[model samples]
Target: MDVTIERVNDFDGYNWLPLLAKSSQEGFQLVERMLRNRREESFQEDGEAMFVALSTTNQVLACGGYMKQSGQARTGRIRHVYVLPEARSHGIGTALLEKIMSEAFLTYDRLVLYSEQADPFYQGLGFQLVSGEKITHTLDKTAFADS
Candidate 1:
C-alpha cells in the first residue's frame, strides 16, 4: 500500500475520520474541542501548530499534530497520534511522526509528548527520555462544560 503524509487544515476531521474508533474517542473529542479554541490557539506565539494525515488512495490511515510549547521554546507536545491497526508497522506512523518532528525541531530544540503506549517506539525513533518529573495534569472541566 502506498501511503503519503500531508498537512491538513483544521476542520478536516472528516478526511481523517476513519483512523479513529470508539476507543479513540478522546482524539476526536479533543479535535472538536480544540477547533473551538483555534482562535486563541492560533494567537500563540512560540511554536507552530498543524494537523497531519497519512493517506492511501485519499483514505486517511493515520493522523497526528504538534502543539508548540510556550515556555519551553524548543519543546512541542504531540497530540492525537493514531493509526489504523491495519496500517501499523508499515512505515505510515514513522513517516507521519518524522514529518511532524522535523517541522517541530526547525523552530524548537526539543519535543515533548506523553507517550502512552508507544514510548519504546519513539525511543527507537531517536527521542531521548528527559528526566522524568512528577507532572500535575489538571484538565479544564470547562473543556466539557457545555457538552
Candidate 2:
C-alpha cells in the first residue's frame, strides 16, 4: 500500500467529504455534530492538525486529528478518527493514531478520545477505558513506540 499522510490545515476541504459521507452512514446527527465541532471549535487551529492517509491513486483512506482540549490543561482530544470501511484492518488507523500521539505528546500530558468500535484498537496503543465510550492515554515522554 503506497499511501501517504499529510497535515491538513483545512478541515472543510473537499478531500474530507468522502470520509464524512461514510461517517454520515453511521448517523446523520453524528456527522452534523462533527461538522459543528470542527467549525465552532477551530479544529485545525494552532494546536491542532488533521492527518489524512491517501492511496497511491490519491484517494483518502483514513482521517484523524487532535485538538487541544479547552476545559483541561495539557489535554488533547482525538477527534474524527476514521478509516474508510473498505480500508479498515489495514493499519491505516494505527498510522494516523501514531502520528497524532507523536505530535500530541509534545504539548499534552494526556490524550482522550471516544469510539464505540475502536476501543480494542486504541487499547492496543495503550489507551485505557475511562467509561463505556471514552478512553484516555496518559502520555509518557518515551511512549509512542511501534504498536
Candidate 3:
C-alpha cells in the first residue's frame, strides 16, 4: 500500500464517490459529510484544515482533519476521519491523524472528537474517552510531548 499524506484544500480531482458508497454501506457518513462540508465550509479561517491519504494509484484511501472548536481558539475538533473498508487495518488512518494532530498542535492545545465503536482506535492513538456535550474522545497537545 504505497501511500502518502497531503493537505487537501481543493477537495477536487479525487474520487470520493466510491468511498462515499462504501462508507454508507458500513453505516458511516463522515466521508460523505466531509465532502459536503468541504464544499460549503468556510475554509477562510485560520485553524480549519483537512488532509487525505493517497495510494500509489492516487486513490483517496482515507480522509480526515481538524477544525477549530467553535469559540475555543485553542481547541480543535477531529472532523470525520474515515478510511475505505479495503483500506482499514492498514496504518493509513493512523498516519493521516498523526499528520493532522501534528499540524494542529502548532496552534491548538487540545483535540476532541465523537466516536461510536471506534473508541479503541482513538484510544490507541492516545485519545481518552470522556463524557461531554457532543464530544466523546479527547487528547491534549501535551500528550504528544516528551516529558
Candidate 4:
C-alpha cells in the first residue's frame, strides 16, 4: 500500500470530505461533525489547522489533526484521530500520531488532547493524565526543536 500523509489545506479539505460518510456508519457521524466544525473555527482564528494521516493507494486509512490553542502560551490540541476499521492494527494510527507529535514538538510548547477511547494509545506516546483537565505532552527539546 502506498501511504501518503499530508496536511488538509483549505481546498484540499473538500477532497477528503467524503470520508465523513465513513463516520456515519461507525455511529460517530455526529461526533465527527461537531469535531470538524470546531476544527474549522480554530483554523479560521489561529491558522494552525492541519489534518495529517496515512492513506493507502486509493483511500484514507487514518486521519487526525491539531487544533491550535491561542492565548499567552502556544499549544496544540489533538482531535478526531480515527482509523478506517478495515485498516486498524496496521500501524496507521501510530504513524498518524508520530507525525502529529512531530509537528507539535517542533512548533509548540505543549500539546493537549481529550482522549476517551484512545487514552492508552496517547499514554504510550508519553502523554500524562491530568485530573479534570486535558491529557498533555510537553515536547522534549533535545529530541525535536532543539535538535
lDDT of 1 by residue, 7-125 (tens): 65544445544544522554445444444566776423445655545455667677677776546644567666777777778887778877777676666555666664676777766
Model 2 score (lDDT): 0.74
Q: Which of the numbered candidates is closest to the native, going by highest TM-score? A: 3
How many steric overlaps are in each model, in order? 1, 0, 0, 0
Residue clash pairs of candidate 4:
none
Over 4 Å off, model 2 = 11-13, 28-32, 132-147
Q: Rank candidates by TM-score, best first.
A: 3, 2, 4, 1
Candidate 3: give the clashing pairs: none
- Which stretches of model 4 miss by more than 4 angstroms? 11-18, 29-31, 34-47, 52-54, 70-72, 133-147
TM-score each candidate. 0.69, 0.81, 0.91, 0.71
Best by lDDT: 3
Q: Which tens-of-lDDT digit does each residue in 1-147 have in candidate 3?
A: 668998776777677888899989988878877777665673436787777799998888988888888776689898878888888998888898888888888878999998877898888888989998889998887786641
List the RMSD of every prediction in angstroms: 9.8, 2.9, 1.6, 3.7
Descending-lDDT candidate ranking: 3, 2, 4, 1
The C-alpha lDDT values of all candidates are 0.59, 0.74, 0.82, 0.62
lDDT of 1 at 77: 72
Q: Mind sharing the TM-score for model 2? A: 0.81
Q: Write the per-residue lDDT of candidate 2 for residues 41-110, one digit (tens) a residue.
A: 6655677877889898888888778888668887888887777888888888888888888888877877
Count backbone overlaps in model 2.
Answer: 0
